[PDB]
């Protein structure tokens, strides 16, 4: 009942896995700066993403035993935003522009699904019943977890190369979201298992449409690849 | 009935006008330049709000009549937010920064409320028939006209000084908002949501005003610089 969802996302995760921009992510005989062409479009998500889990995952004001433990995982997940804006500067990406050019990337048409994920659930998740919200999250975490598992080679490479301590695309990131169960001691309802199904779906939907995103952009920008600088 | 609700909007319209924000906005004693301090915090508000009306208002595929004037009426503030990108270059606030500071400026936890109304709206209306979403936008639309008919104010004493065409802070853009701000029957549960909805956008609107009153306090010498 609940191990058919488990296991839906293990499925989901594998199909995720195998998208084209990670094969392309992966390919070491590709310098990892050009592979690292697609990191400031994570500027439409990674500060959404922060919001999500202040103000949408996380509420202060529930007893239930579920949204406490939700609000520990949110705390950690709403820190990883200011690792981005690190790798953003040693990448190089953190270009001097005008503030109008700066909007106009991020509200990008080519960017709408990266700028709209974390809408998108949070209208999925905010009339969602705690453990359901754990399935959200479970389910948008298993899909960081292959994204940043990719983007921490091209990454490490250029650590290791330039000598700089990189936070996002970087194996310490992909460590605290391995350490990202009580969803194995739980039980649902017919409607509760039809429902979570939906979430799972979605999620990894939107996650593919994401990614496809980012596949676009390498290919529509393929000079601007990283300039990190060496010690 | 529906009646009720389109008083209920007057009403808090009425509140919302005699805001401090405003009275400062209105202050012809006062320099145009200083009371458009608060410009670039629309930043964090006028894209998320053209996505509103592109993506969470709209709904092409309908042949309800209420859905078919919330088509029409979002194509039209779908395309403002170009305006608001014309005006910000004008008064000299489209600056050069860092990436970084510009993401830092929109996520500031001092434009929380004026990043998120967009947000909340969405999630408030996404469930809604459309002649429920209709009450959203009046009362959305509404709110909107009060702050451009109060920034309009120095935005063309801006104008007419420097002789240039402003689209945002602006009577032409109050003339299309004007025209934007029906008699149906609703069951007494529509009622009741429905006063729901003008409580919370006014709310909501209300919280994004106290952040731009903040913002000019904390920022009050980072006037305009418009040239003739
Ligand atoms: N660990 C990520 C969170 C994350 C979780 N899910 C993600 C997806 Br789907 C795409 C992207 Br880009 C990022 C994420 C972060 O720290 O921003
Ligand atoms: N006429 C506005 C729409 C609008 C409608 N409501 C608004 C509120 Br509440 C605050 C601010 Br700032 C803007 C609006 C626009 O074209 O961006
Ligand atoms: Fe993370
Ligand atoms: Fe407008
Ligand atoms: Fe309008
Ligand atoms: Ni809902």
């Not at 004001?61 to 500067?89: C, G, P």
Request: glycine fraction near 2%; proline fraction near 3%.
């Amino acid at each position: 009942g609940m191990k058919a969802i488990l296991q839906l996302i293990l499925e989901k995760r594998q199909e995720f896995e195998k998208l084209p921009c990670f094969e392309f992510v992966r390919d070491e005989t590709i310098s990892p700066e050009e592979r690292l062409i697609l990191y400031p479009c994570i500027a439409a998500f990674a500060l959404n993403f922060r919001d999500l889990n202040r103000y949408d995952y996380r509420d202060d004001n529930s007893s239930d035993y579920y949204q406490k433990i939700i609000n520990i995982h949110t705390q950690e997940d709403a820190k990883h935003w200011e690792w981005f804006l690190n790798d953003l500067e040693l990448l190089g990406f953190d270009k001097t522009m005008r503030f109008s050019e700066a909007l106009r990337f991020v509200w990008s048409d080519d960017l709408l699904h990266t700028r709209r994920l974390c809408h998108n659930i949070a209208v999925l998740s905010h009339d969602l019943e705690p453990v359901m919200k754990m399935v959200v999250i479970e389910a948008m975490e298993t899909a960081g977890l292959v994204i940043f598992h990719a983007l921490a080679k091209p990454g490490e490479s250029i650590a290791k190369a330039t000598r700089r301590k990189y936070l996002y695309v970087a194996d310490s990131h992909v460590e605290v979201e391995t350490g990202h169960t009580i969803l194995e001691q739980t039980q649902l309802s017919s409607e509760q298992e039809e429902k979570a199904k939906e979430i799972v779906n979605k999620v990894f939907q939107w996650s593919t449409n994401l990614i496809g995103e980012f596949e676009r952009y390498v290919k529509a920008h393929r000079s601007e690849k990283a300039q990190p600088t060496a010690a």
